[PDB]
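Reviewers asked in the last cycle whether our approach scales beyond single polypeptides. To address this, we selected a multi-component target totalling 95 residues and predicted its structure end to end. The input consisted of the following lines:
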Amino acid sequence: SPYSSDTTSCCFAYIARPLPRAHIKEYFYTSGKCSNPAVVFVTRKNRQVCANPEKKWVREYINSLSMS
Amino acid sequence: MDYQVSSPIYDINYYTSEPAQKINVKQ
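The resulting structure, written as structure tokens, was:
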């Protein structure tokens, strides 16, 4: 996704099983205005990953992308 | 033999988890 235009719909579901945080490069929010907040994880090939940032375990995933 | 593989490439299994989610169900 070169632009955020591709990502219009908000994730209302979770991935089958937890994704590898080590293959995650960066993260981004859906739209915010969505019924429920959600953050998409960017894999090596920019696959569509949906995880709820309100979860403590998910926050750790986002954290690894933020701090050093 | 029995085969149950449909080639997992994320787009399928990984991102097709929906009927297994509790969408407003009282259990």
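Chain B touches chain A through nine residues (CB under 8 Å). We regard this as preliminary and will revisit it once experimental data from Aim 1 are available.
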